[PDB]
Enzyme design. Structure first.
Site, short mmCIF file in Angstrom:
data_model
loop_
_atom_site.label_atom_id
_atom_site.label_comp_id
_atom_site.label_asym_id
_atom_site.label_seq_id
_atom_site.Cartn_x
_atom_site.Cartn_y
_atom_site.Cartn_z
N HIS A 113 1.46 1.83 -5.67
CA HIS A 113 0.07 1.39 -5.70
C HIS A 113 -0.91 2.54 -5.99
CE1 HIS A 113 -3.65 -0.57 -4.50
NE2 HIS A 113 -3.80 0.30 -3.51
N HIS B 98 0.84 -1.20 0.00
CA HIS B 98 0.00 0.00 0.00
C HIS B 98 0.87 1.24 0.00
CE1 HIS B 98 -3.31 -2.70 1.29
NE2 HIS B 98 -4.00 -1.90 0.51
N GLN C 50 -6.50 -17.52 -3.19
CA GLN C 50 -6.70 -16.72 -4.39
C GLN C 50 -7.97 -17.10 -5.14
OE1 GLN C 50 -4.78 -13.93 -5.72
NE2 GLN C 50 -4.24 -13.82 -3.56
N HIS D 134 -5.77 7.85 -2.16
CA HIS D 134 -6.74 7.02 -1.47
C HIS D 134 -6.16 6.15 -0.36
CE1 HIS D 134 -5.41 3.61 -3.95
NE2 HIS D 134 -5.94 2.88 -2.99
N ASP D 135 -4.82 5.93 -0.36
CA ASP D 135 -4.11 5.18 0.68
C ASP D 135 -3.10 6.04 1.48
OD1 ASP D 135 -5.20 2.53 0.85
OD2 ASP D 135 -4.13 1.94 -0.96
C1 LIG Z 1 -5.20 -10.31 -5.13
O1 LIG Z 1 -5.42 -10.86 -3.83
C2 LIG Z 1 -6.05 -10.15 -2.83
C3 LIG Z 1 -6.27 -8.77 -2.96
C4 LIG Z 1 -6.89 -8.09 -1.91
C5 LIG Z 1 -7.15 -6.71 -2.00
N1 LIG Z 1 -7.77 -6.10 -0.97
C6 LIG Z 1 -8.16 -6.77 0.13
N2 LIG Z 1 -7.92 -8.08 0.24
C7 LIG Z 1 -7.30 -8.75 -0.78
C8 LIG Z 1 -7.08 -10.12 -0.66
C9 LIG Z 1 -6.45 -10.82 -1.67
O2 LIG Z 1 -6.25 -12.17 -1.56
C10 LIG Z 1 -6.19 -12.86 -0.32
C11 LIG Z 1 -6.82 -14.23 -0.58
C12 LIG Z 1 -6.62 -15.25 0.53
C13 LIG Z 1 -7.70 -15.62 1.37
C14 LIG Z 1 -7.52 -16.57 2.38
C15 LIG Z 1 -6.24 -17.17 2.51
C16 LIG Z 1 -6.00 -18.16 3.47
C17 LIG Z 1 -4.73 -18.73 3.61
C18 LIG Z 1 -3.70 -18.36 2.74
C19 LIG Z 1 -3.92 -17.39 1.77
C20 LIG Z 1 -5.19 -16.80 1.64
N3 LIG Z 1 -5.41 -15.87 0.68
MG LIG Z 2 -7.02 1.24 1.10
ZN LIG Z 3 -5.50 0.95 -2.34
#
Ligand SMILES: COc1cc2cncnc2cc1OCCc1ccc2ccccc2n1
Ligand SMILES: [Mg+2]
Ligand SMILES: [Zn+2]
EC number: 3.1.4.17
Length: 305
Positions: free
Chosen positions: A67, A63, A264, A101-102
């Site tokens: 970004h 962030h 993902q 925004h961040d």
């Molecule tokens: C491109 O990937 C992401 C972008 C984001 C953007 N904003 C907020 N959260 C975001 C979250 C994102 O992915 C996280 C996905 C995720 C969910 C549970 C999980 C559990 C265990 C390991 C990895 C994990 N990854």
């Molecule tokens: Mg933000």
């Molecule tokens: Zn952002």
């Protein structure tokens, strides 16, 4: 002035801004000048503003200043490919909201701040960071020679700060789920009305999510390396949660890093694909974002095989 390769590639939704930081401001100015007009902001004042905004971004993995500019480029790409929909002031405000925004992000979520009992969470109970980002935005505008809207009337000034305020707050992903649901019902019932200010605010909110999430709309080598940066912050917050005596959610637990692809998949399913799908339904020229999201989902599916 911009290299010829950037002049061409900058128009693609999947543009990457490159590793040269001193170029990012010139990229943003070109974007503003192409969307808003060069008769719009005084060059010195805007430059002064850009460099102070830069300065108030932190050396965090994701962030960060990079970004900010990347989210602004995605917005630029949306706006370039939907000429006539948004007013000059909306276009000005949205690009500026994206750059800011961040502001002063520490690489920790609202949930960690709340759990930490950070001063900011007592000040802003909901969308804590986002209320802070907007407060920072205002504080920079109020610096001597940093008011890039000085030629606007009082009314337009109040109007564009309001546009900026709602767009920054809408980058709180907690809000996106509700907003996307409202938008999807409006679409399917035939009831979305872009002449209705509240509907218009929703669409802009969704555009802000789309831009904020745009790592998943790049070509796979970009998407895959950006996920390194995203998890670097999540895992650091998880380390911090552990130190508060609180078990982090799996996403933030570095011990569950092997489950990244599954995680993902979850994100693309629950958030990214529905986001760009809804965006393409409202703004068909945004379809390349959705195509690239799907391509990336497939790559995550391939990783799992
Ligand atoms: C491109 O990937 C992401 C972008 C984001 C953007 N904003 C907020 N959260 C975001 C979250 C994102 O992915 C996280 C996905 C995720 C969910 C549970 C999980 C559990 C265990 C390991 C990895 C994990 N990854
Ligand atoms: Mg933000
Ligand atoms: Zn952002």
């Amino acid at each position: 002035n911009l290299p010829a390769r950037i002049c061409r590639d900058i128009e693609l939704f999947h543009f990457d801004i490159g590793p040269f930081e001193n170029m990012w401001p010139g990229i943003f100015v070109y974007m503003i000048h192409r969307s808003c007009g060069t008769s719009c902001f005084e060059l010195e004042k805007l430059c002064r503003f850009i460099m102070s905004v830069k300065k108030n971004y932190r050396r965090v993995p994701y962030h960060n200043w990079k970004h900010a500019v990347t989210v602004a480029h995605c917005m630029y790409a949306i706006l370039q490919n939907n000429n006539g929909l948004f007013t000059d002031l909306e276009r000005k405000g949205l690009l500026i909201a994206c750059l800011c925004h961040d502001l002063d992000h520490r690489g920790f979520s609202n949930s960690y701040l709340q759990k930490f009992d950070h001063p900011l969470a007592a000040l802003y109970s909901t969308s804590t960071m986002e209320q802070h980002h907007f407060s920072q935005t205002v504080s920079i505008l109020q610096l001597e020679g940093h008011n890039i809207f000085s030629t606007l009337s009082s009314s337009e000034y109040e109007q564009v700060l309001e546009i900026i305020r709602k767009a920054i707050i809408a980058t709180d992903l907690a809000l996106y789920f509700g907003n996307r649901k409202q938008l999807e019902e409006m679409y399917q019932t035939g009831s979305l009305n872009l002449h209705n200010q509240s509907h218009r605010d929703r669409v802009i909110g969704l555009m802000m999510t789309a831009c904020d999430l745009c790592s998943v709309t790049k070509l796979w080598p970009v998407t895959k390396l950006t996920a390194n940066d995203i998890y670097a912050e999540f895992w650091a917050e998880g380390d911090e949660m552990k130190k508060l005596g609180i078990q982090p959610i799996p996403m933030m637990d570095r011990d569950k890093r092997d489950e990244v692809p599954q995680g993902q998949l979850g994100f693309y399913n629950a958030v990214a694909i529905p986001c760009y799908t809804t965006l393409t339904q409202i703004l068909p020229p945004t379809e390349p974002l959705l195509k690239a999201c799907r391509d990336n989902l497939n790559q995550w599916e391939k990783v799992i095989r």
